[PDB]
């Protein structure tokens, strides 16, 4: 009923754990927060900002219409200030 690993119960209870994780856990949190709040996430995944779905006048959708020249076609879609 037992294996090599240190019983979770003990670790989650050890003061040493929290001494470590009161630092580590919030750190990742703030890191993820900044990832969004700095707008970096928008560029890593090409996700449109609230003012970047259409052009000012245009009401059409930037649908990719051919596979091979898709990347080129997408870039052209960003051109029209979209």
């Amino acid at each position: 009923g037992t294996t090599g690993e240190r019983p979770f119960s003990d670790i989650i209870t050890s003061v040493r754990y929290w001494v470590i994780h009161s630092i580590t856990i919030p750190a990742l949190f703030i890191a993820g927060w900044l990832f969004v709040s700095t707008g970096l996430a928008y560029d890593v995944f090409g996700t449109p900002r609230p003012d970047s779905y259409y052009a000012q006048e245009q009401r059409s959708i930037p649908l990719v219409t051919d596979r091979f020249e898709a990347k080129q076609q997408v870039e052209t879609f960003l051109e029209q200030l979209k």
Binding site: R49, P50, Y53, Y54, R59
Partner: protein, 335 residues
């Protein structure tokens, strides 16, 4: 005679009957027989029914051009609504068959008996000295029948809006339901499929695990089933070997080792899930529908950015716009 009535009660309650006719059975047996006989005759030979009360009779019986898949017993007329429509409330049977009379006779008799059926699942358990609550598990599929045949009609104000007694008729009930209530986007329903999917999942889980951990008592060319005799003392499978395997598939503590904690979970999961799905239909019977995220996410200017929730809405419109063609005279569907 020790006393006629005293003997009668001893006969009813007797646990020596091939089928346990209980005290609930005294009500169950007749009502179910009426329900089934009326159904069988209707499904085969009943004439078309003016379901929507718009003098637009819908034929759902075999002899009138239907097959098993399309055939159904059509719900009572919308002109009747929630009014009680027994045979003795009609000038003739012709009229009774035209306004969907049989439907009420069936659903009332079924729901009554099927309730007594639950009552009997307690009684026999009482007479045999075993624990009750088996009937409690049966309360979930019954509560679904109640919601679909009674609660929803009560909420909507008519028995014509209850689920038809037929294959294709049930499909109609669903599609329309989806249009008017967006049931797929309702928590209670999602819990239902979760209970139903999980149910089938766990049913296969337990099924496989057990049958896979059977103790060898059979030949190489002999049915593995014969390795069990009705009325055994000891177990026929190694539950400790089962737990050993499943405990390693995921991880030990995420595995059952208590047969009683296992079978409780096996029963609890689907029953609770269907309970919610039954409560879902009963809740959406008063128009508390699923989530409405139509035109939620909009861009910086105000343009509407579509989601899958909007694509769902388009399909729903198609259902709504086309269902019950000639039944509507006014813009809003409040019925």
């Amino acid at each position: 005679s020790a006393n006629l009535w005293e003997r009668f009660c001893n006969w009813v309650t007797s646990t020596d009957n091939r089928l346990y006719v209980g005290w609930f059975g005294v009500i169950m047996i007749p009502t179910l027989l009426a329900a089934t006989i009326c159904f069988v005759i209707a499904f085969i030979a009943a004439p078309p029914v003016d379901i929507d009360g718009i003098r637009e009779p819908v034929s759902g019986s075999l002899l009138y051009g239907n097959n098993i898949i399309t055939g159904a017993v059509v719900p009572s007329s919308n002109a009747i609504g929630l009014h009680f429509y027994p045979i003795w409330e009609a000038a003739s049977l012709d009229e009774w068959l035209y306004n969907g009379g049989p439907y009420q006779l069936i659903i009332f008799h079924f729901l009554l008996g099927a309730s007594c059926y639950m009552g009997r699942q307690w009684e026999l358990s009482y007479r045999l000295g075993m624990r009750p609550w088996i009937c409690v598990a049966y309360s979930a599929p019954l509560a679904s029948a109640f919601a679909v045949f009674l609660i929803y009609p009560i909420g909507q104000g008519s028995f014509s809006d209850g689920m038809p007694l037929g294959i294709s008729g049930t499909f109609n009930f669903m599609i329309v339901f989806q249009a008017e209530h967006n049931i797929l986007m309702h928590p209670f329903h999602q819990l239902g499929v979760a209970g139903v999917f999980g149910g089938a999942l766990f049913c296969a889980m337990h099924g496989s695990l057990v049958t896979s951990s059977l103790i060898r008592e059979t030949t190489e060319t002999e049915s593995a089933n014969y390795g069990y005799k009705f009325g055994q003392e000891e177990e026929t499978y190694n539950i400790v070997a089962a737990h050993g395997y499943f405990g390693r598939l995921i991880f030990q503590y995420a595995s059952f080792n208590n047969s009683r904690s296992l079978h409780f979970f096996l029963a609890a999961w689907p029953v609770v899930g269907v309970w919610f799905t039954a409560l879902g239909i009963s809740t959406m019977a008063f128009n508390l529908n699923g989530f409405n995220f139509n035109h939620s996410v909009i861009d910086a200017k105000g343009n509407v950015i579509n989601t899958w929730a909007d694509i769902i809405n388009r399909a729903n419109l198609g259902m709504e716009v086309m269902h019950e063609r000639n039944a509507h005279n006014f813009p809003l569907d409040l019925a």
